[PDB]
Ligand binder design. Structure first.
Ligand SMILES: *[C@@H]1O[C@H](CO)[C@@H](O[C@@H]2O[C@H](CO)[C@@H](O)[C@H](O)[C@H]2NC(C)=O)[C@H](O)[C@H]1NC(C)=O
Lengths: 22, 64
């Protein structure tokens, strides 16, 4: 699989360049 | 869309703040004598809502 992507306290973002776990 | 929720003689007052990604709202409603400036006297604002949003806020706009 390769779908599980990754790049403040409880701060979140979805805007774009991401890595993902192999 | 990861979060959603549903529920001059007078003045409506409000406070808005974001801390730990929780967005918090307080209010008061009152009669008033004069519209030209805020009333020269004290009354307290009480909480309405606590929202778990996590989203970042630095600008806002009012809806007419
Ligand atoms: C919340 O959003 C603001 C933008 O509205 C972010 O502020 C910018 O942060 C970068 C960091 O490199 C600065 O270069 C900019 O000058 C900042 N802009 C402004 C208008 O302040 C802020 O970093 C965001 N915070 C979080 C935790 O996402």
């Amino acid at each position: 699989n390769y779908n599980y992507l990754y790049r403040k306290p409880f701060e979140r973002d979805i805007s774009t360049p991401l890595q993902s776990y192999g | 869309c990861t979060f959603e929720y549903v529920s001059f003689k007078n003045l409506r007052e409000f406070v808005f703040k974001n801390i730990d990604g929780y967005f918090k709202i307080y209010s008061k409603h009152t009669p008033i004598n004069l519209v030209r400036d805020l009333p020269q006297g004290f009354s307290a604002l009480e909480p309405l809502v606590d929202l778990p949003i996590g989203i970042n806020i630095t600008r806002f706009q009012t809806l007419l």
